[PDB]
Design a protein around this ligand. Structure first.
Ligand SMILES: CC(=O)N[C@@H]1[C@@H](O)[C@H](O)[C@@H](CO)O[C@@H]1O
Length: 235
């Protein structure tokens, strides 16, 4: 199996229509049961987050999710778990899903199955030490980089690879654009079956999310979890 590195990417959504990664990604993605979209036949959105480190807003993000009773899926790294045990515990205690973003956040395509297995299981090990629980296995490739070998291998390891359909620059600390920037992206890029990828490190990301959920719901959107996405497609 091919180990050519691939960077997950796509032309952004337009006119609130789902985006498309093209035939090559779709075919490859489908081949290993990985996806970047949920059910596009309904006004549904799935919130996911990538957490590499804490910059002080995740608690507010969690309070916001609780307020709207929405279930998030947080993809954590080894450092994040080790550094924020209590946040990992709140995510757990509050009904949220904890995804895998690898322990050291390396370029998995440069790793061996032996290494990949440790990169992933060590995150679960730490999460369990803290929660005593373990979510279904979801993986988001560190740096968004992957390959057929990586997909195949991680799938062989029982992981469901989850990409995204909505993302923007809410992770540059040296240039935190404020509430409006993120809020508008979340409104403009919204489409049915959209899988959002957000970070909780930029200034006001929590308040923009708050307003975004508030308004997206007014527009008739229902927020579902990656577990819900999985269950509903099963049937
Ligand atoms: C912890 C963190 O910020 N993860 C990011 C991920 O969200 C993003 O898609 C990728 C490319 O920008 O780089 C990292 O993997």
């Amino acid at each position: 199996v091919p180990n050519e590195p691939i960077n997950w990417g796509f032309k952004r959504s337009v006119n609130h229509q789902p985006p498309d990664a093209g035939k090559q990604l779709n075919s490859l993605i489908e081949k290993y049961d990985a996806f970047y979209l949920g059910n596009t036949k309904e006004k549904t959105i799935y919130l996911t987050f990538d957490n590499g480190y804490e910059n002080g807003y995740t608690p507010k993000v969690l309070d916001v999710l609780k307020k709207h009773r929405v279930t998030g899926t947080f993809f954590v790294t080894g450092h994040f778990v080790k550094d924020q045990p209590q946040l990992i515990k709140r995510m757990s205690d509050e009904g949220h899903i904890i995804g895998n973003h690898s322990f050291h956040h390396p370029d998995l395509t440069t790793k061996t199955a032996d290494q990949i297995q440790d990169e992933l299981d060590s995150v679960n090990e730490e999460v369990y030490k803290i929660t005593g629980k373990q979510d279904n296995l979801y993986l988001r490739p560190p740096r968004g980089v992957f390959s057929e070998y990586v997909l195949k291998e991680t799938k062989r390891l029982g992981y469901q690879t989850v990409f995204w359909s909505v993302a923007f620059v809410d992770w540059k600390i040296n240039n935190q654009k404020g509430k409006k920037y993120a809020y508008d992206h979340m409104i403009k890029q919204a489409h049915p079956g959209a899988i959002y990828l957000l970070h909780t490190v930029s200034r006001d990301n929590a308040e923009a999310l708050d307003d975004a959920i508030t308004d997206l719901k007014k527009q008739g959107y229902t927020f579902k979890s990656i577990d819900d996405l999985m269950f509903e497609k099963e049937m």
